Design a protein around this ligand. Structure first.
Ligand SMILES: COc1cc(C(C)C)c(Oc2cnc(N)nc2N)cc1S(N)(=O)=O
Ligand SMILES: COc1cc(C(C)C)c(Oc2cnc(N)nc2N)cc1S(N)(=O)=O
Ligand SMILES: COc1cc(C(C)C)c(Oc2cnc(N)nc2N)cc1S(N)(=O)=O
Ligand SMILES: *[C@@H]1O[C@H](CO)[C@@H](O)[C@H](O)[C@H]1NC(C)=O
Ligand SMILES: *[C@@H]1O[C@H](CO)[C@@H](O)[C@H](O)[C@H]1NC(C)=O
Ligand SMILES: *[C@@H]1O[C@H](CO)[C@@H](O)[C@H](O)[C@H]1NC(C)=O
Ligand SMILES: *[C@@H]1O[C@H](CO)[C@@H](O)[C@H](O)[C@H]1NC(C)=O
Ligand SMILES: *[C@@H]1O[C@H](CO)[C@@H](O)[C@H](O)[C@H]1NC(C)=O
Ligand SMILES: *[C@@H]1O[C@H](CO)[C@@H](O)[C@H](O)[C@H]1NC(C)=O
Ligand SMILES: [Mg+2]
Ligand SMILES: [Mg+2]
Ligand SMILES: [Mg+2]
Ligand code: NA
Lengths: 327, 327, 327
């Protein structure tokens, strides 16, 4: 019967359409490159106020080179004019009653204990230590640079897909509403402006500057390079996203936030040495570049095609058995 | 007719050859690892002259650890002995006529404005600012360290393909014409010597040292690790390439080059604090490691094979219809 | 004969089992993501002794931010109070007999030669140089901070597979025997504790602290994220490994170990400038994050399936020919 080949042919057509849409969707005809070779250069603009002193970019940004990971310092704890000597440490966990409990077996990873149980103050007696005296007092409260909210991070980024040798940057003037310098990134109003506001990146991360600034944190400015290299070059476009990477699990057991120490090293006119020890809290920024590019290639196209052919060839036989048996 | 199976068999053979060469070419029988786990350690050698002072590696290289991204400083702008205070800023964009136009709404991302319109000089009246005084004057011209051309970057690089747990380095003495220390990288005369000359990397990048040095720039020393792990180990060889990553698009709207500030922090015998503010221009180097390794594996070999079988099985039927119909 | 379809059917079943186990093993039904987007933050705890001075984290860790690559300084060579001037260099390779052999053509990549052959000491006459005087003497022996063995590296790591948008961290309290702070990483007794002991990482690397400390070295703390995202989330677990990346090939020709210089910059009450030049040896740590995630996906499942179907369809025909011919 000719209805055998009309039923057949119709069968073939419908099944072929399903399969074809599925494969063409996922671009299974494409080899993919996922090893994006990115380079990132950043610049911070702004000046803040702290105590009775002004902080400029050289004061609160570290490292100064503009690497993919940098810190804006928002709050700091100063221990000025330390000198090598012996002094009672200030952290309660060094508490003692006798010099018997200041031996080497106590806090083995801690400081260098001299062995003397000495009176730090009238209310607390701690083991004495040799090292930078006086010891740090990391249990006070200090101001935070509010002006950090109005600082700007300018993110130059140049990427290359090496499989296809396709290199492009995120400085796209034909894709920004405003001139390069005047523009600021809004995920909707200007998604390709490379100048981000610190408070913005804080808010897209969905976190509060006051709290973050105080305790420190790690924000990720993610640069994504999903591209179809079958398509025109003007279509390989970077999409920015924002997240808080020091995300706070409910369990905790470790102090959240971000802080690190470093010293400004001075030497006396006398000759002896003395430093200013700084415990710094601020927002670390991690520009995380992702990308993946697809291109037509003879081998994945052939493999995808053969897969389609055979899959339909079986689909019509099983559809014939299900139809003929009618259940 | 036996000519049916001679025509058939010949058909089969030719088509099979085409397909086989295509698949064997792309090594479709291989699973590929593209997540190269690289570690890079660099060392700069050389000394330059600047003003009436000598710069050695500790003076002009930053950071000193030898990371994958480091800067050779070729020109710098010194603002010596800054102190916290009030002074007219020097940048014309702060110009004012009355203190009415030095309110907070002016240059909100700029410095900390005191509110006074003051006479910086007799020809320019700018808003006064609180901060490091005197302000910077970033519109002058200074010399550049020419000797930077004769500096050398020694690039130790150790990579590992984790899918295959295949780790190798780029220090290959059996692959260099000269002893390790005496050798210098030439893309032809010695493509595996890990000691590169700064001016060389500048020239392979195709850019002029004088200009670059003056304005700063970002060069990429790309280490490529394309390897067939089916093949012998002696064949996993690194290939170096060189490119300028701060490439200059015609549109511009942002100053090209590379510069960053940082301060040397001093404290008076009196007690007050004072810094030397340095605006640094130089060549940043970005060692960008790429690699991808192939290996035979049962699954991609089976999939590739099945693809070949079916593709020929259809190719001979369609060749039979085209031949039989003769058009 | 019904034995034709019993032999057939049995054939089909056995071959189908072989193929099915092979494909299901390699999870060929999965698309794989190998572009792990990781962020690493590290903290060092401990204090060491060096000469008659104490070193704390700000003194011996660099950079202080806690990046994926940081150095614990174990031994250092101090050249105190350098000043710009002219002096005979101390390295024997500058040896001369007359000022004729101190011209510009000698050691062109070396220092700035003045041109005078001068008597450094009574036993050695070297070319004079302009630069930081006195010159460095990098041929002496100094102590090493032994307490570095009892220091701890705490490795916070947050990863994201962007293809599947699957983000997880290595801080897993339900996976550690001990509270987060008290725990220490043992590859068996606690493989998910993020606090590693320096001497531990040295020993898992299989190297001796005394020797390493003295000469410097590069250790890699590898964080591996092999995960089946078909499987439950609690199964995406990080596995740590440890290796020495400045591995010593037998050929050598370059000094092993790890060292870098940097200067502490001071200025006189007089006004002139003078630095302390430090040649630092220590253990650099490279947290190298790898990961690869698999997930079921319609396209690789279809391709794998079709491959299986056709492979069995041919396997039974060739098994029929081998059986029928009986050899
Ligand atoms: C410091 O200079 C740079 C540096 C970079 C890299 C190194 C991040 C850069 O990346 C691009 C280069 N080319 C285009 N089309 N887009 C880019 N995003 C642009 C400049 S530039 N010319 O100053 O603005
Ligand atoms: C600082 O020391 C290093 C460091 C590295 C890594 C960390 C970059 C190194 O990488 C190799 C190690 N092994 C081989 N075969 N090739 C390499 N390229 C070699 C030395 S070394 N032994 O001083 O020259
Ligand atoms: C500095 O703070 C951080 C930072 C990070 C990243 C930036 C490395 C971090 O990574 C995780 C975040 N969330 C989970 N579940 N696991 C993690 N490993 C945890 C903390 S935290 N909350 O202080 O301990
Ligand atoms: C580390 O601390 C232990 C005490 O817990 C001590 O016995 C050991 O000697 C220390 N290691 C070094 C190298 O000092
Ligand atoms: C140098 O002088 C300071 C006080 O000005 C003193 O505390 C210190 O001990 C002196 N240095 C030496 C080595 O005596
Ligand atoms: C940022 O600048 C605007 C002026 O453009 C000002 O109104 C605002 O208060 C500033 N933000 C902070 C946190 O000071
Ligand atoms: C310290 O002395 C300098 C001049 O030598 C002076 O300008 C400065 O104001 C003094 N510091 C204080 C706190 O008075
Ligand atoms: C580099 O050294 C050579 C001598 O080997 C010298 O002729 C040349 O002038 C030097 N280059 C520069 C820029 O000084
Ligand atoms: C400053 O004084 C030191 C000695 O205290 C001297 O060596 C140096 O030359 C002086 N500086 C100048 C510029 O004379
Ligand atoms: Mg403390
Ligand atoms: Mg300025
Ligand atoms: Mg030397
Ligand atoms: Na197939």
């Amino acid at each position: 019967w000719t209805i055998g080949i009309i039923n057949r042919v119709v069968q073939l057509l419908i099944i072929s359409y399903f399969v074809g849409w599925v494969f063409l969707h996922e671009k299974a005809y494409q080899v993919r490159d996922t090893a994006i070779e990115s380079s990132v250069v950043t610049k911070v603009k702004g000046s803040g106020l702290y105590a009775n002193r002004v902080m400029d970019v050289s004061d609160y940004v570290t490292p100064p080179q503009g690497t993919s990971v940098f810190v804006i310092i928002t709050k700091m704890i100063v221990t000025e004019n330390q000198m090598q000597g012996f002094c009672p440490e200030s952290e309660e966990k060094y508490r003692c009653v006798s010099d018997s409990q200041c031996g080497p077996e106590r806090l083995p990873g801690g400081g260098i204990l001299t062995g003397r149980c000495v009176n730090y103050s009238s209310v607390l007696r701690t083991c004495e230590i040799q090292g930078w005296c006086p010891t740090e007092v990391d249990t006070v409260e200090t101001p935070i640079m509010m002006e950090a909210e109005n600082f700007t991070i300018f993110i130059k980024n140049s990427i290359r897909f090496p499989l296809f040798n396709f290199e492009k940057g995120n400085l796209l003037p034909n894709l920004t509403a405003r001139d390069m310098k005047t523009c600021r990134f809004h995920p909707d109003k200007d998604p390709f402006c490379p100048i981000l506001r610190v408070g913005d990146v804080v808010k897209f991360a969905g976190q509060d500057f006051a709290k973050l600034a105080r305790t420190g944190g790690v924000l990720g400015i993610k640069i994504g390079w999903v591209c179809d290299l079958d398509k025109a070059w003007d279509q390989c476009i970077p999409k920015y996203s924002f997240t808080r990477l020091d995300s706070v699990s409910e369990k905790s057991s470790v102090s959240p936030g971000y802080n690190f120490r470093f010293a400004k090293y001075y030497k006396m006119e006398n000759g002896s040495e003395y430093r200013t020890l700084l415990k710094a809290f601020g927002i670390r920024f991690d520009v995380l570049v992702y990308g993946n590019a697809g291109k037509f290639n003879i081998i994945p196209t052939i493999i995808s095609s053969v897969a389609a052919f055979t899959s339909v060839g079986v689909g019509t036989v099983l559809c014939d058995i299900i139809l003929l048996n009618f259940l």
